[PDB]
């Protein structure tokens, strides 16, 4: 539209030559309201120029520039951030209301003798004049004044506003502008994060600036021609609960570069000291994150084909994202193609997918039901007293895992819905997400009056 002045929200190290290195606070000259994930910018601070990630800047002198404004973040995700144990009382953020378009919301962390650590949500009424107010008896001209005022007096709020909600730098959309197929010499593998059946995983760095996860397929796993073909679709899948596909190295051995999840896989995270303190409310919430990512996959008319706790990756504040979606199809192994052998996840595979190769989003729904048993058992293998060989015949005859101990029979009933024989009667991920987000009377409710 018209080159305007922007401000940097976070630091960013120049990963390439064409991008722009800038620190939080730098005034940037960018073409206003220009579509894309990478915008051309001119730094009025350093006089340097280059492309910048569009989610690292906001118009100067706008609410988006304020560090306590989190934009279109959900009530459920705001609570995740605010309920962090290291946040003091009065840790807050401002966001948009999900139940009242045009209104804002002040989310604040608080402590109570009944609930303990909880978040209070206060709706902010914006006026035609531009003024904001939480209660009728105290009003302000700007959202900034409101924050300043309640940072000195609770005056009705559960607690004075103390700290702004901590946040980690968001992901850029792609490693760089036009960056997709990269050379192997651009990746530097630093730490082996783990090992799979068809290759290894690595913590590395691209251009020695940005930390990424590098998956290395052993030769013969999949043809580069078909991997690149499918990778043009996986690069389109962008959602907060999907691990982002960054780049690829075409020449075998194929390397897959993805966003790095520091807490490891959900399965391992459910075991050991990490999973000791997890309680059902957190497991249900983690299920809702997974269902949200799969609901996006469901909207894009895509199929995961290998949904299981081992392919869910954990981050800070118990963030969970779906990983390794769409790779299972490209496996060239004759035994995995015919879903046989000790390397096929038969215990997460719907019977019609294992018997007739009918992989659909509904067979992922089946997999989700299995995944829920891993969550409510903290990593226990499905069908524990059964070997792969015998699972498919038992579920084909109608056997279903019973309600695990420490699993509410209401969630096992959800599991059995996912385990219906008829795929088209299995529920959607839109349903599962809403069900699991509202499991504890948690359906968008109760802004404090
Ligand atoms: N994007 C990632 N970020 C951080 N760690 C990862 C990532 N992807 C995989 N890992 C780690 O590497 C290991 C191997 O992953 P993978 O080869 O997909 O094994 P599988 O899918 O069979 O569990 C996992 O246990 C996980 O902890
Ligand atoms: Mg995997």
SS3 257: strand
Query: What DSSP letter does each residue of 63-76 carry, written as one string?
Result: GGGSTTB--S--HH
Question: What domains are defined for the chain?
Answer: 3-62 (2.30.30.40), 75-150 (3.30.505.10), 184-258 (3.30.200.20), 266-437 (1.10.510.10)
SS3 34: coil
Q: Which of 47, 66, 50, 44 is nearest to 12 (CA)?
A: 50
Eight-state DSSP code of residue 206: E
Nearest to 94 by CA among 105, 103, 83, 102: 105
Q: What's the 21 CA to ligand 1 centre distance in angstroms?
A: 30
CA trace torsion 191, 224, 232, 351 (10° rounding) = -90
**Tell me, what DSSP letter sits at residue 311?**
G
Helix (H, G, I), strand (E, B) or coil at 402: coil
Element spanning 369, H or E: helix 361-376
- Residue whose Cα lies nearest atom 12 of ligand 1: it is 194
- Look-up of token digits 């385990």: 419
What's the token pair of residue 341? Answer: 């052998």
The resolution, in Å, is: 2.4
Q: Please check whether residue 4 is in contact with residue 53, taking contact to mean a CB–CB distance below 8 angstroms.
A: no
- Phi and psi, residue 376, nearest 5°: -80, -5
Which residue owns the Cα nearest ligand 1 atom 9? 201
Torsion region of 251: left, alpha or beta (phi above 0 gives left; psi -120 to 50 gives alpha): beta
Q: How far is the CA of 324 from the centre of ligand 2 (A)?
A: 5
b (16+ CB within 10 A) / e for 411-439: bbebbebbbbeebeebbbbeebbbbbbeb
Mark whether 306 is an active-site residue: yes
- Helices 409-418 and 429-437 cross at an angle (nearest 10°) of 170
Distance (Å) from CA 347 to ligand 2 centroid: 15
Binding residue ranges for ATP: 215
Cα 328 from Cα 222, distance rounded (Å): 10
The C-alpha R_g of the chain, in whole angstroms, comes to 24
**Which ligand number lies closest to the CA of residue 193?**
1
Query: Which secondary structure element, helix H or strand E, spans residue 291, and what is its range?
Result: helix 280-299
**How many whole angstroms from 308 Cα to the centroid of ligand 1?**
12
Instruction: Put residue 393 in one of left, alpha, beta given phi > 0 → left and psi -120 to 50 → alpha.
Output: alpha
Residue closest by Cα to atom 16 of ligand 1: 196
CA contacts within 13 A on the Cβ side of 268: 12
Atom of ligand 1 nearest to the CA of 198: 17
Tokens encoding 449:
């009056």
Q: Which two tokens stand for residue 413?
A: 């009933």
Which of the listed residues 193, 213, 242, 331 should we mutate to test ligand 1's pocket, taking the one with most ligand atoms within 8 A of CB?
Answer: 193
Method: X-ray
Q: Which ligand has the nearest atom to the CA of 313?
A: 1
310 touches 256 (CB < 8 A): no
Q: Output the residue whose Cα is nearest ligand 1's atom 13.
A: 194
Q: Which ligand has the nearest atom to the CA of 246? A: 1
Find the 353 Cα to ligand 2 centroid distance in Å.
Answer: 18
The pairing of beta strand 312-314 with beta strand 255-258:
unpaired
Asked whether the beta carbons of 427 and 100 are under 8 A apart, the reply is no
Choose, from 110, 285, 306, 324, the residue flagged as catalytic.
306
Residue located nearest, by CA, to atom 19 of ligand 1 = 196
Task: Check: CB of residue 132 under 8 Å from CB of residue 143.
Answer: yes
CA distance 256 to 246: 8
Q: Cα dist. 429→125, 207, 367 in Å?
A: 33, 38, 11
437 Cβ neighbours under 8 A, 6+ residues apart:
76, 288, 292, 443
Binding-site residues, please? 215
Pocket of ligand 1 (CB under 6 A): 193-197, 201, 213, 243, 258, 260-261, 264-265, 310-311, 313, 323-324
Question: 13 is written with which tokens?
Answer: 């190290």
Residue 296 · residue 353 · CB < 8 Å: no
What counts of helices (H) and strands (E) characterise the chain?
A: 13, 17
Residue 160, token pair as written in the block: 């004075």
The pair of three-digit structure tokens given for residue 311, joined into one six-digit string: 């392919």
Peptide bond into 253 cis (omega under 30): yes
Give the other-Cβ count within 10 Å of 101's Cβ. Answer: 7
The number of the ligand 1 atom at minimal distance from the alpha carbon of 243 is 1
CB 283 within 8 A of CB 376: yes
307 with 429: CB under 8 angstroms?
Answer: no
3-class DSSP assignment, residue 156: coil
- The string of DSSP codes covering 166-226 is P-PPPPPSSSSTT--B--GGGEEEEEEEEE-SSEEEEEEEETTTEEEEEEEEPTTSS-HHH
The span from the first CA to the last CA of the chain, in angstroms, equals 41
Q: How far apart are CA 126 and CA 235, in angstroms?
A: 38
The Cα–Cα gap between 366 and 350 comes to: 6
How many angstroms does the Cα of residue 214 sit away from the middle of ligand 1?
10
Residue (of 257, 91, 260, 242) closest to 187 by Cα position: 257
Tell which atom from ligand 1 comes closest to the C-alpha of 200.
Answer: 17
CA-nearest residue, atom 1 of ligand 1: 260
């Amino acid at each position: 539209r018209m080159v305007t002045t922007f401000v940097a929200l976070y630091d960013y190290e120049s990963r390439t030559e064409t991008d722009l290195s800038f620190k939080k606070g730098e005034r940037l000259q960018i073409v206003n309201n220009t579509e894309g994930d990478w915008w051309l910018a001119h730094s009025l601070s350093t006089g340097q120029t280059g492309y910048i990630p569009s989610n690292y800047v906001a118009p100067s002198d706008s609410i988006q520039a304020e560090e306590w404004y989190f934009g279109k973040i959900t009530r459920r995700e705001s609570e995740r951030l605010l309920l962090n144990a290291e946040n003091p009382r009065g840790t807050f953020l401002v966001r948009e209301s999900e139940t009242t378009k045009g209104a804002y919301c002040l989310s604040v962390s608080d402590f109570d003798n009944a609930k303990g650590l909880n978040v209070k949500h206060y709706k902010i009424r914006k006026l035609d004049s531009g003024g904001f107010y939480i209660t009728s008896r105290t009003q302000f001209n700007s959202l900034q004044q409101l924050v300043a005022y309640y940072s000195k007096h609770a005056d009705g709020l559960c607690h004075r506003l103390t700290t702004v909600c901590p946040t980690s730098k968001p992901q850029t959309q792609g490693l760089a502008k036009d960056a997709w197929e990269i050379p192997r010499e651009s990746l530097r593998l630093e730490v082996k994060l783990g090992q799979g059946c068809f290759g290894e995983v690595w913590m590395g760095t691209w251009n020695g600036t940005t930390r990424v996860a590098i998956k290395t397929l052993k030769p013969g796993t999949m043809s580069p021609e078909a991997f690149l073909q499918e990778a043009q679709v996986m690069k389109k899948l962008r959602h907060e609960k999907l691990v982002q596909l960054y780049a690829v190295v075409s020449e075998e051995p194929i390397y897959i570069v993805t966003e790095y999840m520091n807490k490891g896989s959900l399965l391992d995270f459910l075991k050991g000291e990490t999973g000791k303190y997890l309680r059902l409310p957190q497991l249900v919430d983690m299920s809702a994150q997974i269902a949200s990512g799969m609901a996006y996959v469901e909207r894009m008319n895509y199929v995961h084909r290998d949904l299981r706790a081992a392919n869910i990756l954990v981050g800070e504040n118990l963030v969970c994202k779906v990983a390794d979606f769409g790779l299972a199809r490209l496996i060239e192994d004759n035994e995995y193609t015919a879903r046989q052998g000790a390397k096929f996840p038969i215990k997460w595979t719907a019977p019609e997918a294992a018997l007739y190769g009918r992989f659909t989003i509904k067979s992922d729904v089946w997999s989700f039901g299995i995944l829920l048993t891993e969550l409510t058992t903290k990593g226990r293998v499905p069908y524990p007293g059964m070997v792969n060989r015998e699972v498919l015949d038992q579920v084909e005859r109608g056997y279903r895992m019973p309600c695990p101990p420490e699993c509410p029979e209401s969630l096992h009933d959800l599991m059995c819905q996912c385990w219906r024989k008829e795929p088209e009667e299995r529920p959607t991920f839109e349903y599962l997400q809403a069900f699991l987000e509202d499991y504890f009377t948690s359906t968008e409710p109760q802004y404090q009056p």
